[PDB]
Amino acid sequence: TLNGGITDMLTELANFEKNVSQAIHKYNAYRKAASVIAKYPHKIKSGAEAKKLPGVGTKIAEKIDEFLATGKLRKLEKIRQDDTSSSINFLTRVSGIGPSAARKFVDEGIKTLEDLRKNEDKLNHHQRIGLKYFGDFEKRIPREEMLQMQDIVLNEVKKVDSEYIATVCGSFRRGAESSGDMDVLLTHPSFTSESTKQPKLLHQVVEQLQKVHFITDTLSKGETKFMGVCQLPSKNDEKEYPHRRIDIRLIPKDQYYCGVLYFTGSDIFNKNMRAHALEKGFTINEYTIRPLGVTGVAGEPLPVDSEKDIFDYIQWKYREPKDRSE
DNA sequence: CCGACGCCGCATCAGC
DNA sequence: GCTGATGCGGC
DNA sequence: GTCGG
Ligand SMILES: [Cl-]
Ligand SMILES: [Cl-]
Ligand SMILES: [Cl-]
Ligand SMILES: [Cl-]
Ligand SMILES: [Mg+2]
Ligand SMILES: [Mg+2]
Ligand code: NA
Ligand code: NA
Ligand code: NA
């Protein structure tokens, strides 16, 4: 937490630019600088020192000098006082309410948690579940609970079909002591990039987890991505566990390594890696790494037998999941 | 200076 | 109904 | 907002 003051400041600026300004590149600029500063192994003593890092330019250097001199940022101090900006930032904390819906709700004088409850019929299904579990979804998940949740999902997936393989990704696979939600990558040999030999491969898993009352709500659901809500069972007389967000991603089995690279993250690690892939003349998604022809259009998928092969193609030394927490 | 900034599944809506 | 654009959230 | 060419 060596430069937590600075990185917190940059994260709040990033959220402002995303949520209020709707300037996504500024959002990504602030988050990149927050990321490079967060892994910097010295207590930053000036904006000039920070400007030496990639992603910190003149404007952020100046903000860091202001913050180091005073402990505050006038720009953020003004943003916190503006009622419209703080209302928009609040509403975007509801899953399913993004920058556009948040500004629309504010325009209708729907600006508080009480306002949202009073107007639940103006919400789509995603938003209604995000409001229902608003408090729960902002709690973090201790890794001990992640371990219990892992055991349920893997055992229940095994009961459906022992040929499924379920892998918990996200921050859990990076070794985090707590996670914001649970990310599950799913494969089954009937689903490859070559053919889908069995229908309902994700649905059957989802229904099994609902049947045993682990999955409690559904935000969205298609043939390959499920996003919903789950809950650990609690013991007699004990308070219930918080409800938790769970994402399940069914990936073609022959594309597992690209999929587990993507689902392990972090999000900034994936942006940096895919950006560097482009500079090396490749494009990476959760399925494939493909070369870029001279015209810059993706060619055919390159063979991939491990996460490290992907690293090898773009001339990066391998980084274990726990070193990907950017 | 200026273009480029990672890549995509699902939900929802406009237009046909 | 379909196709395309947009919003949103995922890493 | 930052950066590479
Ligand atoms: Cl922008
Ligand atoms: Cl501040
Ligand atoms: Cl792969
Ligand atoms: Cl692909
Ligand atoms: Mg996660
Ligand atoms: Mg996340
Ligand atoms: Na810099
Ligand atoms: Na939101
Ligand atoms: Na997730």
Residue A94 in marked binding region = yes
Are A246 and A228 in contact by the 8 Å Cβ rule? The answer is yes
Count of all residues that appear for chain A in the document:
326
Considering any atom of strand C, list protein residues whose CB lies within 7 Å. A 92, 94-102, 126, 130, 169-171, 180-181, 183, 227, 245, 247, 262-267, 270, 286
Please tell me whether residues A126 and A98 are part of one structural domain: yes
Please tell me whether residues A154 and A125 are part of one structural domain: no
CA of A223 to C1' of B16 (A): 27
Cα gap A107→A89, rounded to integer Å: 14
Helix (H, G, I), strand (E, B) or coil at A287: coil
Cα gap A178→A171, rounded to integer Å: 8
Question: Is A239 noted as a catalytic residue in this protein?
Answer: no
Q: Give me the domain span that covers residue A96.
A: 83-139
- Expressed in angstroms and rounded, the spacing between residue A181 Cα and the centre of ligand 6 is 8
- Nearest 5°: the CA angle A30, A247, A322 is 55
User: Which residues fall inside 5 Å of ion ligand 5, going by CB?
Assistant: A 170, 181, 183
Q: What is the domain-level CATH number for residue A102?
A: 1.10.150.20
Q: Tokens 């689902």 map to which residue?
A: A263
Please tell me whether residues A154 and A240 are part of one structural domain: yes
CA A224 to chain centre: 17
What is A156-169 written as a DSSP string? HHHHH-TT-EEEE-
Are A283 and A290 in contact by the 8 Å Cβ rule? The answer is yes
Within chain A, what is the greatest distance between any pair of CA atoms?
66
Residue A183 in marked binding region = yes
Structure tokens of A149? 């949740």
Residue A115 in marked binding region = no
Q: Tokens 């060596």 map to which residue?
A: A2
One-letter identity of residue A296? G
Q: Mention every residue, 6+ apart, whose C-beta is less than 8 A from residue A256.
A: A165, A185, A187
Ligand index nearest the alpha carbon of residue A309: 3
Are A50 and A36 in contact by the 8 Å Cβ rule? The answer is no
- Expressed in angstroms and rounded, the spacing between residue A190 Cα and the centre of ligand 8 is 35
CA distances to A32, A157, A172, A188, A238 from A233, rounded to whole Å, are 38, 17, 20, 27, 10
Q: What is the domain-level CATH number for residue A220?
A: 3.30.460.10
- Expressed in angstroms and rounded, the spacing between residue A267 Cα and the centre of ligand 6 is 7
Q: What is the domain-level CATH number for residue A61?
A: 1.10.150.110
Give strand ranges (E) for chain A. 141-142, 165-168, 178-179, 182-187, 215-221, 225-230, 244-250, 282-284, 289-291
Structure tokens of A319? 């980084």
Q: Which residues pair with A113 in a beta bridge?
A: none
Catalytic annotation, pick one of A18, A32, A59, A63: A63
Please tell me whether residues A174 and A254 are part of one structural domain: yes
Preceding omega of A35 cis (within 30 degrees of 0): no
Number of domains composing chain A: 4
Which of A62, A82, A102 represents a domain boundary (last residue)?
A: A82
Specified resolution (Å): 2.0
Please tell me whether residues A257 and A286 are part of one structural domain: no
Q: In terms of DSSP H, where are the helices of A119-266?
A: 125-132, 134-137, 143-160, 170-173, 201-211, 256-264
Q: Which residues pair with A184 in a beta bridge?
A: A168, A248
Identify the burial level of A25 via C-beta atoms within 10 angstroms of its C-beta, where 0-12 means exposed, 13-18 middle and 19 or more buried.
Answer: exposed
Cα gap A258→A284, rounded to integer Å: 8
Please tell me whether residues A198 and A246 are part of one structural domain: yes
Structure tokens of A96? 């399913």
Q: Mention every residue, 6+ apart, whose C-beta is less than 8 A from residue A134.
A: A93, A94, A113
CA of A48 to C1' of D3 (A): 17
Ligand index nearest the alpha carbon of residue A50: 7
Cα gap A137→A124, rounded to integer Å: 18
CA of A180 to C1' of D3 (A): 32
Please tell me whether residues A130 and A172 are part of one structural domain: no
Binning chain A into helix, strand and coil, the percentages to the nearest 5 are 50, 15, 35
Residue A250: phi and psi, rounded to 5, are -90, 120
Judged by C1' against the alpha carbon of A265, the nearest nucleotide is C11
User: Which residues fall inside 5 Å of ion ligand 1, going by CB?
Assistant: A 23, 25-26
- Expressed in angstroms and rounded, the spacing between residue A156 Cα and the centre of ligand 5 is 20
